[PDB]
Amino acid sequence: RPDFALEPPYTGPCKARIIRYFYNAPDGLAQTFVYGGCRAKRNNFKSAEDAMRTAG
Amino acid sequence: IVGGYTCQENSVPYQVSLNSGYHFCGGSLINDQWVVSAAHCYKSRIQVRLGEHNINVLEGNEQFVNAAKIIKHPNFDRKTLNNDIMLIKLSSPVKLNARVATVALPSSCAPAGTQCLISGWGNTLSSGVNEPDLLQCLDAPLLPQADCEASYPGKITDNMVCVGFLEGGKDSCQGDAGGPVVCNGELQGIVSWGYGCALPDNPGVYTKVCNYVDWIQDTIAAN
Numbered sequence: 535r536p537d538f539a540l541e542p543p544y545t546g547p548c549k550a551r552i553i554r555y556f557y558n559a560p561d562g563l564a565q566t567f568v569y570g571g572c573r574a575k576r577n578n579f580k581s582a583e584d585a586m587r588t589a590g
Numbered sequence: 591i592v593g594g595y596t597c598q599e600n601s602v603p604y605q606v607s608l609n610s611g612y613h614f615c616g617g618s619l620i621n622d623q624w625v626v627s628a629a630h631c632y633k634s635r636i637q638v639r640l641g642e643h644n645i646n647v648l649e650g651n652e653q654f655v656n657a658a659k660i661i662k663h664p665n666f667d668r669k670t671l672n673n674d675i676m677l678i679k680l681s682s683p684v685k686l687n688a689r690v691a692t693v694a695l696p697s698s699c700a701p702a703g704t705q706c707l708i709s710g711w712g713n714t715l716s717s718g719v720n721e722p723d724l725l726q727c728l729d730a731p732l733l734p735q736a737d738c739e740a741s742y743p744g745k746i747t748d749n750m751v752c753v754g755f756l757e758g759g760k761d762s763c764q765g766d767a768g769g770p771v772v773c774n775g776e777l778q779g780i781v782s783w784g785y786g787c788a789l790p791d792n793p794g795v796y797t798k799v800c801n802y803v804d805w806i807q808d809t810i811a812a813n
């Protein structure tokens with residue numbers, strides 16, 4: 535699978551509280567984390583199904 | 591807010607919570623129909639909650655009002671966060687009382703060393719996640735621009751100001767963005783960004799509101 539799928543979730547420097555989905559490579563599943571609102575990385579999705587379709 | 595204290599119920603009447611299903615940012619009421627927040631808190635649909643203390647329990651003093659217009663600063667930069675300010679016009683004027691009040695815009699730019707009050711419902715831990723039910727408060731000073739620049743080499747613009755402590759331990763965090771930094775009764779800053787939360791040598795960075803008073807007033811008058 536893509537490299538960005540193996541990277542841990544990136545909250546970023548912004549201080550908003552936005553729930554986003556990411557692919558948890560080890561556990562091999564899609565979960566949620568707190569995104570700050572800016573400078574998002576690729577392992578950041580607005581929906582679970584969108585995460586699985588890309589990192590599945 | 592990391593390392594702060596629970597605010598006295600309704601002691602920060604100008605604080606608002608931005609909600610689109612859940613609390614995601616703070617804001618400040620500046621007049622009966624307008625709220626100021628951070629541009630990175632932009633959402634196509636936003637509900638503003640005023641008169642809040644415990645964000646997860648209906649207390650009876652709250653007012654729920656939808657945003658009618660959302661206006662980000664035209665020069666907002668999503669990468670550098672320069673000009674991280676946004677205005678929200680409410681669908682209808684709110685009722686001003688002891689629990690819901692406005693905060694004054696700055697008369698001038700406050701000098702470094704000025705003690706201020708920061709508030710919000712953001713994360714309270716530097717490591718891990720702990721979202722508070724009750725509004726949190728933090729007394730912190732405006733830092734000298736030189737120390738701000740030294741903490742964030744080449745990342746600080748004239749539209750930003752650092753507030754907090756270089757030793758870390760106390761700071762704003764995720765969930766606090768858009769929130770107020772009030773010094774001597776005037777809104778001097780808007781919670782914007784920072785590297786981590788409450789980490790040494792990385793104090794929070796805030797939008798310097800005194801540089802936008804004219805933009806705010808002109809925008810409100812034209813909308």
Ligand SMILES: [Ca+2]
Nearest residue numbers: 644647648649
């Ligand atoms: Ca409540």
